[PDB]
Amino acid sequence: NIFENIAQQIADGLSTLTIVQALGFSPSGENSETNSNTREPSTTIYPKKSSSDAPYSITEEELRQAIYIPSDFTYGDKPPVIFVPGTGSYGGISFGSNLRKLLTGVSYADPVWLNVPDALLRDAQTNGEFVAYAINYISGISGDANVSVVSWSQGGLDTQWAFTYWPSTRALVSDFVPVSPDFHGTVLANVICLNPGAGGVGLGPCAPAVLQQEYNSNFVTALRAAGGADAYVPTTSVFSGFLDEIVQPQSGTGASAYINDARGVGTTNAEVQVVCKGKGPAGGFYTHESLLVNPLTYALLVDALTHDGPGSVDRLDLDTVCSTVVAPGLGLDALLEIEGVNVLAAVNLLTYSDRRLAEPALMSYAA
Ligand SMILES: *[C@@H]1O[C@H](CO)[C@@H](O[C@@H]2O[C@H](CO)[C@@H](O)[C@H](O)[C@H]2NC(C)=O)[C@H](O)[C@H]1NC(C)=O
Ligand SMILES: [Ca+2]
């Protein structure tokens, strides 16, 4: 029986590989990207909720289908929480072994998650459309409750892009909790794609979302010049300065994950090695992916969800939070699962058929 659950886990993990999907399989289980969601929202959200919003380029059918609503969802009784995966991954598997498992069956959260086609590798401007639609749609079918957003890696960058160009979504998000975000992209993408940045032809073929996540990319530059480098809602950014093998730089105020707060809406910038320094293993070495099981990450998420404003380092009992390797309620097996999540993602990055020399054109709205 325990065998059947491992077989089904592996099958669900492999269905997220685009090479396997090319054989005609679809993402399965919690990574299903063809969900049937038949409730309508209280208000027109398509093609625009606000006449200030950027247009959608993707059909509402596809936008809505990437949202995975568990049967246990309470449509507003609890506060909804939308989970957003990172590059090469799906919302189901990015968080099922970590944060979303911990947020299943509690009173202050009600999880749903995004399964974007092609493992979040496609143009990030369209990944951003998925987050914008999800915020408006989930709220609009949940009694117009506020939602929260938790993201991993490019997910946070996608959320800032939805906030920047879909203003209507700012009004409905109590908390944005990005884990290992790259709000300034990453120079490791410039290196791997042998690419000058600024959308220039580079010698390394790379997925569109990878090219747009270069440190100086047109996507990142446009987003930051439009306001994407400052928080729009209370933002609890959690990142590791030792060592993020995907996102660099990633330490101090210069970290790609650092969100400024010029609008004064409230921000926490938590480098775990800083916050937990001298106080336990949770201040030790954490990867881009292993951060998702760090107790500081979980503690700051719950704090943010149970209090006005962002998660508060100073309100936490750092002596207790920092004292363990993994969040309470996970085992060291979560450390293993999250390593496999990263491997699957890596495979996707290396083997995705849509490799390009140049970064997607900015849509007319971003320019
Ligand atoms: C839902 O979240 C939004 C954004 O965090 C909240 O809207 C902000 O509310 C504060 C004070 O209530 C205002 O000063 C800001 O200008 C608002 N921001 C935006 C962009 O609207 C809103 O209060 C939350 N709603 C609920 C019911 O929690
Ligand atoms: Ca809060």
Q: Is 151 exposed, middle or buried (0-12, 13-18, 19+ CB in 10 A)?
A: buried
Task: Characterize the bridge pairing of strands 67-68 and 110-114.
Answer: antiparallel
Give residues whose Cβ lies within 5 Å of ion ligand 2: 175, 304
Whole-angstrom Cα distance, residue 73 to residue 110? 6
Q: Which residue in 128, 140, 134 sits closest to 365, CA to CA?
A: 128
**Do residues 199 and 358 touch, judged by C-beta distance below 8 A?**
yes
Collect all residues with Cβ–Cβ distance below 8 Å to 29 and sequence separation of at least 6. 8, 11, 12, 15, 92
Q: Is the peptide bond before 328 cis (omega within 30 degrees of 0)?
A: no
172, 189, 239, 324, 331 from 17: Cα distances, Å: 33, 20, 26, 33, 26
127: tokens are 């990944």
Report phi then psi at 186, rounded to 5. -160, 135
What is the Cα gyration radius of the chain?
19
Collect all residues with Cβ–Cβ distance below 8 Å to 7 and sequence separation of at least 6. none
Task: State the closest ligand 1 atom to the C-alpha of 234, by its place in the atom list counted from 1.
Answer: 5
Residue with CA at minimum distance from ligand 1 atom 10: 265
**Do residues 119 and 16 touch, judged by C-beta distance below 8 A?**
yes
Compute, in angstroms, the gap from residue 309 CA to the centroid of ligand 2: 4
Task: State the closest ligand 1 atom to the C-alpha of 233, by its place in the atom list counted from 1.
Answer: 5
Whole-angstrom Cα distance, residue 120 to residue 35? 17
The 3-state secondary structure of the chain reads CHHHHHHHHHHHHHCCCHHHHHCCCCCCHHHCCCCCCCCCCCCCCCCCCCCCCCCCCCCHHHHHHCEECCCCCCCCCCCEEEEECCCCCCHHHHHCCCHHHHCCCCCCCEEEEECCCCCCCCCHHHHHHHHHHHHHHHHHCCCCCCEEEEEECHHHHHHHHHHHHCHHHHHHEEEEEEECCCCCCEHHHHHHCCCCCCCCCCCCCECHHHHHCECCCHHHHHHHHHHHCECCCCEEEEECCCCCCCCCCCCHHHCCCCCECCCCCCEEEEEHHHHCCCCCHHHCCCCCCHHHHCHHHHHHHHHHHCCCCCCCCCCCCHHHHCCCCCCCCCCHHHHHHHHHHHHHHHHHHHHCCCCECCCCCCCCCCC
Q: Which of 81, 136, 174 to mutate to test the pocket of ligand 1 (most atoms within 8 A of CB)?
A: 174
Domain positions in the chain: 1-351
Q: Which residue in 312, 330, 271, 364 sits closest to 103, CA to CA?
A: 330
Experimental method: X-ray
Whole-angstrom Cα distance, residue 205 to residue 224? 25
Compute, in angstroms, the gap from residue 131 CA to the centroid of ligand 2: 19
Strand pairing partners for 268? Answer: 236
25, 62, 194 from 127: Cα distances, Å: 22, 11, 24
Collect all residues with Cβ–Cβ distance below 8 Å to 94 and sequence separation of at least 6. 83, 85, 86, 113, 152, 155, 292, 341
Collect all residues with Cβ–Cβ distance below 8 Å to 43 and sequence separation of at least 6. 49, 140
Report phi then psi at 232, rounded to 5. -105, -25
Q: Is 166 exposed, middle or buried (0-12, 13-18, 19+ CB in 10 A)?
A: buried
Q: What's the resolution in A?
A: 2.5
**Do residues 133 and 161 touch, judged by C-beta distance below 8 A?**
no
Provide residues with CB under 6 Å of ligand 1: 146, 170-174, 233-234
340 is in an annotated binding site: no
Strand pairing partners for 79? Answer: none
Fold for 1-351, please state it. Rossmann fold (3.40.50)
| Total length of the chain | 367
Whole-angstrom Cα distance, residue 148 to residue 165? 18
Helix crossing, 332-351 with 2-14: angle to 10°? 30
281: tokens are 């293993």
**Do residues 142 and 111 touch, judged by C-beta distance below 8 A?**
no
Lookup result for tokens 């140049």: 358
365: tokens are 């709205």
